[PDB]
Symmetry: C4
Subunit: 353 residues, 4 copies
């Protein structure tokens, strides 16, 4: 039975080694966060508009001014190769077949260059800054290979305390490559090329990356730039003031700070304050979750675990199936609430509970 | 033990094939909706009025200006024959013996004409529009055979995603007839009588049916007309403005949109805004549920699954028993809260929790 | 282990026949009411006053202007003989030894006269009106035998729908006497003494008893009169206006109307509106429950099932033990919240949750 | 697996005799209090400040004007020797190695003098007053041996009703010493030295200790004085007015009054009203719990059971490990919410839920 995202989660759990499944599904500490990410959607119910002609529906929408098949994206997730062989390519091809963007992680198992050469869809690059020089190298690499959008993830200044991994002594799978860091010299001696080696031989990121650093990145990247990991309208607004073209409200799927609010709690406020694209992720599993966020003003929703379940369970085809189910889910929901054009969604279709 | 509706549900589950029971009991997706439909009643508790003479009580009430034994109706449910042989007739005869109306579904297993010929009670007809011409045919058929009231169901523009049915590969029982669509010609060639054949060979309804179409139906039907499936005071009000004589607030028993609000959430508002009869269904199982809705202003409550449990468990007699229990339940409740005349119910007997 | 009321409930369940225990513990319908009666106490928490000299504490308090050892009473419960031999006398003697009143039920197994002759404590009489003449007879009997206070129970106009009893086909135990109705003639022919026989051969009360009838009772009884079963400040106030000396807010321990509010929900309002003694029962099990009600203004709390568990488990001694535990519980609580004199309790010691 | 406080609780339960574990873990009556102490932390979630340089973090903070490694303390707990041999010394040495204060209980198994001679850390003394003269003796003893701060515990005027202990007939372990009461004469005859003997041969404290008595203690102790066990801003304020240098909001870990509010419910109010140090304990287990209290204004958090689990499970090393985990937890949390300096915490990092 594969009729929804949960069914794929169940199949993924049966096919993945326990430790890998725990690494995928787990959250920080007590996992009250991942639970809250799901529960928060129950804070809204639908108030359908009846007797509306919904015989012709449209899920097409512009994201950052660019039209795509539906307001969804496959978000950045690292080590996809640990879930399925060439997982990054499988996800990218599925997203492309579905008409939506795919975001490559800095911690991907397939290089920025290799993916761009094997997939002609809308590719976005998610940046983690460990070393400034190295980050600049990846950004320019993404720029020269055709990536349209750059996403800076800011919520991993330090690593999340995920206790399932600690119990399993989880170790990055051997057959797994941190490809984007491949070839980066040594032999070279001196502050950097030594200060850089010391940063790469560390599992932590640049915790000093601040607003000033964002300005630096803004000048380096000429196309659309989004800041991911925000949990307040104030931070979202500051990002826009600093040059960002939009933001991605997110708590990293409950994997970093167990007691973090769900981004849904500041979505409407961020939309009203910034006046710029506000994308969102964390906790989305049903089409109704997605429609609620869009109704509150979100530009688009990024999928994390939902499509990874499809990938882990059935590879590229699994991802295709999950996207197909979610699209039909969203479409069905639009028909049921009387909003034939997805771009017409508004808070008026919701009831606060 | 058959002392309440739940007892009949239990007996029905024991007598019906699993797949049929799932088709009856199931809701859309996570079934949070059917649960919410039940839980919402706990939002109100009773504040009885003591030392009131309740030695003489009356459940008699006018519905759409017509007196009936109690403010209940057996609502429209399709494929009743799948629950018990000649289920439509069993329900109709039980309703008639109880002094309340019975609403025949467009998807009934007994024809509009056959029921009218075998039952002299107050028969209502519920219309689903798949093809305009065909719908017009059924409406006139109902008109000519004595049906007093027409109910347009508007919440199935597309089919609900009921996962139990998907798991069971549920198929409309073979010995089961969609009688009202019987004999409708073919052989005939041309747009319609081809555009009509194409619509009938489809399990979906006319998703384009809108306010303009309601006006069309309003002119076709000369008697009382109600619009069913509304979940907002605004839509209820528009229905009245368009000619409807009343509305039926409903989320189709949680079978269409899992995250829909319960109609109880907009009952008081709809009553105050429309100033016309506001009937309601979805989630009613105890007499207290019914009394709460009536106290909030509902004209009457339509039963869906409650009487179907009686039907599935013990046929016509089972329906009689459920109606008898519910009537005694309502009567007992009226005595206990100090409101001897059911028409005297008001919000004053309730406490918001 | 017998350290609290729950421990006695557990022991009572082990010693009583299942059907008798169900008759004692059961509530109306879904039993959401008995649960709510318990849960409502969690709506308040304590805010102790520290550094208060609590070396000398007093639980003594006036109830209806008469001093008693503590603000508790053993409330009226019928058929006590079904729980323990001569249960009425056991409860009365325990209450008397504890320095608190005992209320005899109209449905007691020991007569008004016999109890008064075998117990010299403060005896109250609870009246159920089935037949006016018969009620007048019992009232005068109670008056002539020394009962100090009369309590009219108004929440059983019709019998509660207790489904455990229906499942067990519960029948009033054979060795059990409805003593107060003993000897009341027949042979006599004519309206009454025929209209009265017809009322006694019925398990229902006088559902017509109203405000006018209360006035009648008020003139018949010369001492303190309380009206029991009220669930609104408005009704409590009307009772005072009609002559009552106080009221007992109660939902009959969740045995009559499952969806009734808990009397705790209207306690403060009733105290403020009436300006007269407001006693209360329903759901009290811990000393903290009792102290919360007293802090909100209740004059006293009547125990129903709490002391019946002591009775069913260990007879008179069991009741003594429960009263001893509850008194020590209340005393301990007063010390802990910094209110040495029970009459000094106020809302200031509580925090609404 | 020892990655958090709960893991140590689990290990402690496996190593301690059931009755000892129950004595440690148990709460008063229904234990709704200990549960509420944990649940209340979910009333707040974090709203991280992104793009803040958190590469350099500091947990250093002043408590009562004195700098310590982090805003934590090992609070006063009696009979520590029942959990691990020389438990008081183990806890003190661990606290000292961690750079935080340790508070010795009046009911400790190691004397005030012996601890001061074997540990050079910041030692605080918690006072329970059973007999004024005896209390004065301990206070001066603590003064002369180097204790920097005096804590008066006011929430045990009478003993809490902990039912686990009653079920286990819990008795203070034989090999266990109430050392601070050692040698206190007898043979001596007369009011006191007879009135004092009678008070010591009692398991109850001086329930008369009031505001006047606090003034007495204030004049006796020349250094920092804190009053522990407060549950209201009003009492906290009165303590400051009476001479206290700060307070410790606490419900004694849910061990005294089951229905007491959690001190977290009056933390912000106490901070705003008193304008003096407000420390707090009761329910703290995760670094997030601690950070939430500090953000609301708490000067420091005292650990009760958290470090006792470390002690019971693995002695001094266990305590060291728990403190190490909690410090890394707090540090990690500060980085994640964007507040590098612990003294910069404010309500702005929280979202009320
Ligand atoms: C296995 C896994 C790995 C992840 N790796 C990254 C990463 O490399 N970069 C990033 O920006 N976010 C990363 N994320 C976070 C996701 O982008 C996204 O915020 C999160 O999954 C959304 O929540 P959801 O899983 O409930 O959909 C990861 C999430 C998961 C589940
Ligand atoms: C088995 C089943 C079939 C149904 N078929 C129809 C139908 O043909 N027409 C219609 O208007 N509603 C239909 N409904 C919805 C009911 O009219 C009603 O809205 C719903 O059952 C009310 O909720 P309840 O089941 O909790 O009482 C159906 C419901 C059930 C349970
Ligand atoms: C077994 C049983 C019999 C009762 N019989 C009577 C009665 O004869 N008269 C009356 O006024 N109330 C009667 N009551 C109600 C009690 O007076 C009281 O309202 C109720 O028990 C309070 O709730 P509690 O059981 O939670 O304490 C009865 C309750 C029980 C449990
Ligand atoms: C086993 C045990 C013994 C205690 N003994 C004392 C004591 O002697 N003096 C005191 O002031 N508090 C005493 N307390 C209360 C603690 O100081 C502190 O208020 C409480 O443990 C805080 O809650 P927590 O256990 O959830 O951290 C004790 C607590 C426990 C668990």
């Amino acid at each position: 039975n594969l009729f929804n995202v949960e069914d794929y989660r169940k199949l993924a759990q049966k096919r993945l080694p326990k430790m890998v499944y725990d690494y995928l599904e787990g959250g920080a500490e007590d996992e009250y966060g991942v639970k809250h990410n799901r529960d928060v959607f129950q804070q809204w119910r639908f108030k359908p508009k009846r007797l509306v002609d919904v015989s012709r529906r449209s899920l097409q929408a512009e994201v950052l001014g660019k039209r795509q098949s539906m307001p969804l994206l496959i978000g950045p997730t690292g080590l996809n190769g640990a879930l399925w062989p060439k997982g990054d390519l499988a996800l990218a091809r599925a997203a492309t077949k579905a008409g939506i963007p795919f975001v490559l992680s800095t911690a991907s198992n397939m290089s920025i260059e290799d993916l761009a050469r094997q997939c002609d869809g809308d590719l976005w690059f998610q940046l983690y800054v460990i070393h400034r020089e190295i980050a600049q190298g990846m950004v320019l690499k993404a720029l020269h290979t055709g990536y349209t959008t750059l996403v800076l993830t800011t919520d991993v200044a330090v690593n999340g305390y995920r206790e399932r991994d600690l119990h399993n002594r989880f170790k990055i799978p051997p057959f797994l490559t941190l490809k984007n860091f491949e070839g980066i010299d040594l032999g070279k001696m001196d502050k950097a090329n030594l200060e850089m080696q010391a940063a790469l031989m560390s599992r932590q990121m640049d915790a000093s990356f601040n607003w000033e650093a964002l300005r630096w990145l803004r000048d380096l990247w000429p196309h659309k730039l989004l800041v991911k990991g925000l949990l307040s309208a104030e931070d979202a607004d500051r990002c826009i003031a600093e040059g960002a073209d939009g933001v991605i409200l997110s708590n990293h799927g409950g994997r970093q700070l167990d007691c973090a609010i769900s981004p849904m709690e500041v979505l409407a406020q961020s939309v009203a304050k910034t006046g710029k694209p506000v994308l969102i992720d964390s906790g989305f599993r049903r089409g109704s979750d997605i429609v609620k966020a869009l109704a509150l003003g979100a530009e688009a929703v990024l999928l994390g675990r939902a499509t990874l379940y499809g990938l882990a369970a059935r590879g590229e085809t699994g991802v295709d199936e999950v996207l197909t189910l979610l699209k039909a889910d969203i479409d069905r929901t639009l028909a049921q609430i009387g909003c034939p054009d997805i771009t017409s969604l508004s808070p008026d279709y919701l009831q606060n509970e």
